């Protein structure tokens, strides 16, 4: 459910339409009692303004904190503090297992709200430790994970998702599995591995019905953006376009649906202006990516690939119009992209052929073998050197 908060963060990250989301972002810490925490979440947003608060500036677009946001925070910590103490007292009276862990979570929330991040993490470990069912242990990891995802600090997210996945078969906490599927996909977007996200998301929709987690419909929409970015058309074709998920929702999909339709129609002018549209509505609406530069390279390389894959020759004009990006730009990107060999092409600009060496040929299979092969020799030498003396 708190997945909305991540959508607020994301849109300002690329500096375009930031203005409205900045305000909406600010409102969430009042409720929570998160004043201090906000500065930390602000960090994730980076490459745009997020600095102004009641305790800071009021000059830039990002929204001022209320006098009320501050006061609510004072209330919340007092109240949290009161709950923690109260919860322990009740624990002495009755069962040890359930009651005590609930108490430690109160302590972690209290430290997490004032801003003592280190303090919150030692407390959170305590929670995990205490003897209760595995099912109950999972419930406690999901809150910290969401919080972790917000800051986009990598370490926190790794730990939680990884243990959470183990427990499912062993406990038999299949019921928890539903929240978890969505949670695995969040992790998967969060590292610079959009590849994983594309396979992960598609699975997530079919196995999900409901058990205390964000709507079904929201995921499907999100599935399309990951699916396209990572996957090439034959994989994409089977999975989403023939598959159930995208069709059932129908509405609220047009940016993404326009992409799939255009790609089917195979008129590349139409696909490229929809690339841009799905980049602005969907892709920038995610905070996710520990280096944004990787996200941009993958969307351009994918679209490029489709155009080049279909044709061994194109005239330069058809290719250049289809992209809609500059001579300077096309060239500038192309030099980086070719090295990888996902494109594997070259531009005969003076006769006007866009030739493709073919990423399905002998030239390709060689490029990979050699590239891996040479580096392996250097490695045998480093191992060999240690062993003799």
């Amino acid at each position: 459910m708190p997945l909305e908060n991540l959508e607020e963060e994301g849109l300002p990250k690329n500096p375009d339409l930031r203005i409205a989301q900045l305000r909406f972002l600010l409102s969430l810490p009042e409720h929570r009692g998160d004043t201090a925490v906000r500065e930390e979440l602000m960090a994730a947003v980076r490459e745009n303004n997020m600095a102004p608060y009641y305790e800071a500036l009021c000059k830039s677009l990002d929204w001022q904190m209320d006098m009320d946001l501050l006061s609510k925070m004072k209330k919340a910590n007092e109240e949290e503090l009161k709950r923690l103490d109260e919860e322990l007292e009740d624990a002495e009276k009755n069962l040890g297992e359930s009651e005590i862990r609930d108490a430690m979570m109160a302590k972690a929330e209290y430290l997490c709200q004032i801003g003592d991040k280190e303090g919150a993490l030692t407390a959170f470990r305590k929670t995990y430790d205490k003897t209760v069912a595995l099912g109950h242990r999972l419930d406690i990891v999901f809150y910290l994970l969401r919080i972790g995802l917000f800051y986009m600090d990598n370490d926190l997210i790794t730990r939680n998702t990884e243990k959470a996945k183990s427990l499912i078969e062993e406990g038999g906490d299949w019921d928890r599995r539903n929240r978890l599927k969505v949670y695995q996909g969040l992790y998967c977007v969060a590292i610079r591995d959009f590849k994983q996200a594309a396979e992960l998301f598609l699975d997530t929709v079919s196995t999900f019905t409901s058990y205390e987690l964000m709507d079904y419909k929201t995921f499907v929409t999100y599935t399309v953006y990951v699916s396209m970015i990572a996957l090439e058309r034959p994989d994409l074709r089977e999975k989403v376009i023939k598959g159930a998920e995208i069709l059932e929702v129908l509405h609220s999909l047009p940016a993404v649906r326009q992409y799939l339709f255009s790609l089917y129609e195979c008129r590349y002018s139409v696909f490229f202006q929809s690339l841009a549209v799905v980049e602005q509505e969907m892709k920038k609406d995610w905070l996710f990516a520990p280096h944004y530069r990787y996200y941009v390279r993958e969307m351009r390389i994918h679209a490029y690939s489709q155009l080049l894959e279909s044709y061994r020759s194109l005239t330069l004009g058809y290719m250049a119009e289809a992209f809609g990006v500059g001579v300077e730009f096309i060239d500038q990107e192309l030099s980086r992209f070719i090295a990888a060999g996902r494109l594997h092409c070259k531009i005969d600009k003076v006769n006007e052929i866009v030739e493709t060496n073919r990423p399905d040929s002998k030239n390709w299979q060689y490029q990979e073998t050699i590239k891996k092969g040479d580096l392996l020799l250097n490695r045998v030498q480093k191992l060999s050197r240690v062993i003799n003396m």
């Binding site: 690329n14 500096p15 375009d16 002018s269 490229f272 202006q273 690339l275 841009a276 980049e279 602005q280 944004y292 530069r293 941009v296 390279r297 351009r300 004009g317 250049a320 119009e321 992209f323 809609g324 990006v325 500059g326 730009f329 500038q332 990107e333 980086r336």
Partner: peptide, 24 residues
């Protein structure tokens, strides 16, 4: 070093809308 692609993001979206008309 740092990828020129990032700087390219803002510039590439806008280019697309104009370019298609400008050149065939």
């Amino acid at each position: 070093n740092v990828e020129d692609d990032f700087s390219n993001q803002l510039r590439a979206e806008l280019e697309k809308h104009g370019y298609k008309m400008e050149t065939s």
